[PDB]
């Protein structure tokens, strides 16, 4: 009911001001805040800030003085802005909707990729919530029971702890919401569960498409996190 797509530059050069765009289609909304996350090589996702449907924005203190997010309603469109870019800001960059009444969807964009001309070498401060993901890859066979943990280095409403299923060539899909609630298109094999500073994600049964990548992710505290991720593989090649 609601579709994004991100277009810009796939290429910068240093101290230029790296900018995007993102085109919003679908119906009318009455809430919300439209994200900003990008994703660098090794598939870490860094949460860079929001617009609300009020205008009000949010920014991740590591990007604070760099950094600017801006509407435009009468075309559909929200706007992201970097100035200073370096080697550092090499990455797929996406725009996302979530509205707070419904915890149970989010919409993702394409995610159009941005480099910047080879070279790179600043004025936050704030604290985060470190989510772990170990193993980082994994192989079962099909039918095995799996298992995935999640760790937080600090407590976090497990309302707040969501997970989130990849593939390559594609964009995060929200898996499961408020620890142990399956998204809509995912197969009830899948379960969560957790609390404090402990979740974990089960697939009761192992399938072929169930091989990608899962990140969990904690929104309890600002700047929302992302974890390192694990990689599911088949085994037998
Ligand atoms: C679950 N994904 C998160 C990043 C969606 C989101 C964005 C902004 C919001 C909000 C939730 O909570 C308050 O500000």
């Known amino acids: 009911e609601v579709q994004l797509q991100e277009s810009g530059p796939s290429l910068v050069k240093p101290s230029q001001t790296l900018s995007l765009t993102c085109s919003v289609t679908?119906?009318?909304?009455?809430?919300?805040?439209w994200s900003w996350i990008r994703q660098f090589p090794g598939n870490k996702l860094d949460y860079m800030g929001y617009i609300s449907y009020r205008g009000s924005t949010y920014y991740n203190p590591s990007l604070k003085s760099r950094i600017s997010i801006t509407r435009d309603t009468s075309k559909n469109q929200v706007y992201l802005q970097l100035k200073s870019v370096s080697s550092e800001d090499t990455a797929t960059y996406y725009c996302?909707?979530?509205?707070?009444?419904?915890?149970?969807?989010?919409?993702w964009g394409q995610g159009t990729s941005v480099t910047v001309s080879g070279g790179g070498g600043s004025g936050g401060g704030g604290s985060q919530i470190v989510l772990t993901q170990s193993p980082a890859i994994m192989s079962a066979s099909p039918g095995e029971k799996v298992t995935l943990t999640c760790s937080a280095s600090?407590?976090?409403?497990?309302?707040?702890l969501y997970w989130y299923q990849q593939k390559p060539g594609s964009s995060p899909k929200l898996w499961i919401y408020?620890?142990?609630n399956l998204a809509s298109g995912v197969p009830a094999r899948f379960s969560g569960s957790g609390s404090g500073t402990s979740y974990s994600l089960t697939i009761s049964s192992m399938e072929a498409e169930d091989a990608a990548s899962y990140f969990c992710?904690?929104?309890?505290?600002?700047?929302?996190?992302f974890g390192s991720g694990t990689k599911l593989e088949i085994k037998r090649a």
């Open positions: 679908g119906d009318s909304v009455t809430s919300g805040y």
């Open positions: 992710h904690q929104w309890s505290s600002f700047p929302f996190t």
């Open positions: 996302s909707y979530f509205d707070s009444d419904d915890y149970a969807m989010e919409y």
């Open positions: 408020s620890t142990s």
């Open positions: 600090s407590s976090v409403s497990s309302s707040h």
